[model samples]
Target chain A: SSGLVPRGSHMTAQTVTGAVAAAQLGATLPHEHVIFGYPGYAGDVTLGPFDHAAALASCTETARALLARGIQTVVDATPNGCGRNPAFLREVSEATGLQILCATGFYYEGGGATTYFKFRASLGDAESEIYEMMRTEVTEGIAGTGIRAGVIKLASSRDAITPYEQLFFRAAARVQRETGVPIITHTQEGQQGPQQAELLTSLGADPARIMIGHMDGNTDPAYHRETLRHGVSIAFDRIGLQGMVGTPTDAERLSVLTTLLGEGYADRLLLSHDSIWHWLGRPPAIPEAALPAVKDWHPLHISDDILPDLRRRGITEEQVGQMTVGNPARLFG
Target chain B: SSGLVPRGSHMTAQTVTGAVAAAQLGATLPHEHVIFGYPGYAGDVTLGPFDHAAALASCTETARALLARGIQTVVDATPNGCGRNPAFLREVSEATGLQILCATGFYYEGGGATTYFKFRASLGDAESEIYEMMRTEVTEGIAGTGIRAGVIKLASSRDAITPYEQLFFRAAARVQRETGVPIITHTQEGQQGPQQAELLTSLGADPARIMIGHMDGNTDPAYHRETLRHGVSIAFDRIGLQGMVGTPTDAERLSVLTTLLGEGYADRLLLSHDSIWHWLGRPPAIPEAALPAVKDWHPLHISDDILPDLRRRGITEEQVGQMTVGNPARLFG
Candidate 1:
């Protein structure tokens, strides 16, 4: 395995102004955000007040920061209702000359209320809509641009799969059947990675083809071991976000990776920062304009610095290479 | 609160099987079995594996066991689906000189699948049936045994109330509205005690008049503190079943009791082993059962010995009086 091949189109100058950059090459920031704005996507009932312009700008700054940090591949985590923006991702890639991999999948319970299936649409109709959106994004381009998605995304909340998510997983199964792209998933908090993997694998998706994201948050060792033993790629995505609803710190995340490596699961581990800033409005007390420059906010943007944090915690470069280079290469290959 | 006024009248000859000694003493086990059967109730599918004869025999033996334990209030936890046998409870009460409290309410989720409501009946219909049953148990004396349930039994699983259990809670709320008997619930495993209380209280059920059973199963101190803060009566049931998942030992149970007592919430703490061993085909292999004379394995069969353990744990007799006697009396009164 080598590293991710960024195949999406680039975004040009936009009205949204921020310190934005592009992915270089040979580096993979497996989880980053090009669209952190989940506005009307959460239905007319908004979860919280969100500033889209600030969020978009912060994403650009974060991408630029990651590029400066030597990251080349950015796996955009925001899915459809959760601020997934392939069009803007194309613009960002175009502006920064970075490889941005756009994600496609349904989110957990609350996030799925916008999808047609949650409103009880027919399975065929739901599958066709998802397949068309993903297919168009991958084959033709997203919304209009030639920037295509390179991976399928799936997600679930809590331990159990919601009926709506199951439908989405089934749809992703169909998408994978049509396209050979690997799948990525936003696993719910706690020790839900194994169960998520079981669900995806049970749905006929290759466990090895799936990156179970947010696994670093789980405290259960046996769960992580069992999930990796199942040949699923474990993404330590939230390597920087700590102490938020069971999110592990970079040190703890590296400990998990080191343990997994000691157990010979290096090929099964992928490193990414599922970093989001300003998704929850501008930081309190900070001016809205300065929100994009809030450098210490997201995990992925500071990931290069955190790699040393992992080294201090005893994670070897060989293992990191397997996760950063080998695993994503095989997955994206 | 005062000890549970025995609820449920369905203890039969079969209900008294293993309950030989308890068969006679108007035993208010407070949580027992009547038609302790329902692999699939609404579908009318009886688990042929279920032994009704054995259940009746256990009722007799449970009566005997309670007699030995000096217990008199056998409040059946049988809410619905399992035929609440008022006549049988009366027979067992008459036979054993015990007061058998008959339960009246809809069943829990797994039990809901076997219910007629699962087929076509609506929540209103279920509420109607629950109210009528409670009304009959209270006024008419279930099956002409002149024995009425002293408490309205209820149960919920997980944090979010399922539609079936919500209907049950609504029906119990109606019964509480009509009868004023406190609702005793079989709370599910997990950190759902506060949420379950919220569901009941939000449904207009009197939290003070409800005993949220199974608080000890959840180990989170915050859960205990918050639930105690709510006016709802917290039942530290499953006292002796320490090895059971999250089951508090005599020490942990008393620790919680002491903490609540210090917080002036002793009146809100109810103590009882929400144990019904005969419901299972075989006795649980509790080590205490292997000792001399403790042949049966209902975790609460040692309910008689629990007070002593509490006393030994430095829980004063007056505190015991509040938890085991006074609090129940006040709630039921």
Candidate 2:
């Protein structure tokens, strides 16, 4: 179980533009989506077509906003089938100098584009091919864009991980072990953080290099503690999201963060808004009508509202920086 | 409308395999489909992943079966973005000698792929480009496979056509005017047949060269009269399609065909079963449960059951031959 760390492990944090020393990944939002479309957008050609120039402009605006708020880097956690555009991220990075990172895996089984992989899996050729896909994206580039992915992102369902999802986790774990690229993950609303943590670590991934994402989905203090006990960093990432599909409000998210930081778990957590800069299709009516309620779910929320709220909650600036800065730096490091 | 037929119009019928003389397109099913997927099948890569070898074998078997039934030529009416698979159609044509014809056009507004074209429409570059896309496929070959499209297939929604769909119709009409390629169309249920026919003809397409598809969606004698009265040929093509969203059964289709023939409309009518070989996804539960009821919805239904029914109903072999062979020849030639 114990081997000495390699002299200053050459493991660098990969970015869409290039690799960087972990220290250079300054004040990162470890989980966010720069460009993502739900699976199956390509079938309809003309209706709400994705315009590259428009998307690049919109995302660059969001990135510049994040830069003004001291969030210098963001790891885009969208999966391959879910509109993971490495070139788009590289474009945003070049335009705003936001130091964007993108991932190299698939989403969870329930909502993922699992058709092709599941078909390959049925033919018994899926696992090794999946490992090579993620490894190559990290070691080489995504889809020959030559813009290498910096992290690996995998996911689980709300309460349990399925067989098809297990295939993705194993591949993600193997890639992280082989390449030293840190891993991040999605925990569907309110559950699976602990399960995802345990599974990846048991498959030979180092927990220190893994971040269990979307912990804000749950409010139970014991749930956060149980997940953190796996020695993995956790993210209260879906900040400021409220009142859709019964998601926790920003108040609940803040209340839970208080418990974690007061109990000395600041280094075991990271923070992000999980805000999407652009959604590919036309906005749905219900969300567009009432989306302003969660309008606080943006890059400015944590800087303007969250830090002030924490100061009033008696959380020292040191704890805030650990969750916002020191924790992410060392996680990538 | 006043022009005479160009001295024996050198216009020949296009097939997925190659061009053929109208005399060779014997016993044609003018409005059938070879390979198709609805708007978004490509988004789910593996769920019901399309296997090239399996699709080819599956389609070839169906083609050979049609060959046995004496349906020597079949027009594949699937559009550009909906898994058109020109190369696959050519493969099936080669394997079975089925003389298959594929199309080049987009689908209707409500159900067809509208995203990309709509965006191009918004940017003011859609209309001319759409003309080029269809023209290129018919003359230069689809997506560079060198498998040229045989017809132009466009569609309209229930009773009314949208502006974006009208844009497609114009391009299709213009391409037909310039290239001598025949035009075919889809009528949503039975409502849009007359509307689509008028739109295409008014836009410079020849009514004599147009075939209105899915005319059997309605059992209305008046609807058939109105559509064919436009001087466009009609296909009671959804034959053997029993009880889908209230579509007429083979019995009703026979009744309408009987009436049309008695009224001197045999020369303007064609027949086919719009049966798809493979659906590209795992079968949906409701349809799969009820699908067995329409198990008669195959190539054998027309030859084995339909012809015999027609003979018993006082429909002479002469009228049937004119529809099955003479009508398709005149439209293409």
Model 2: per-residue lDDT, tens digit, B189-234? 7788888877887887878788888898888889889988778899
Cα lDDT of model 1 by residue, B40-122, tens digit: 21111111124556666767776666667656555666654344555566666676765555565545554322223432233
lDDT of each: 0.57, 0.77
Deviation in Å, model 2, residue A110 alpha carbon? 20
Report iRMS (Å) of candidate 1.
22.0
lDDT for predicted candidate 1 compared with the true structure: 0.57
Against the true two-chain complex, what DockQ does each candidate achieve? 0.01, 0.07
Tens-digit lDDT string for candidate 1 (A258-298): 77777777778777666664443212333445443343336
**Top-lDDT candidate index:** 2
Q: fnat, candidate 2?
A: 0.04
Please list the Cα RMSD from the true structure of every candidate, rounded to 1 decimal place: 20.1, 9.7
Residue A18, candidate 1: Cα error in Å is 23
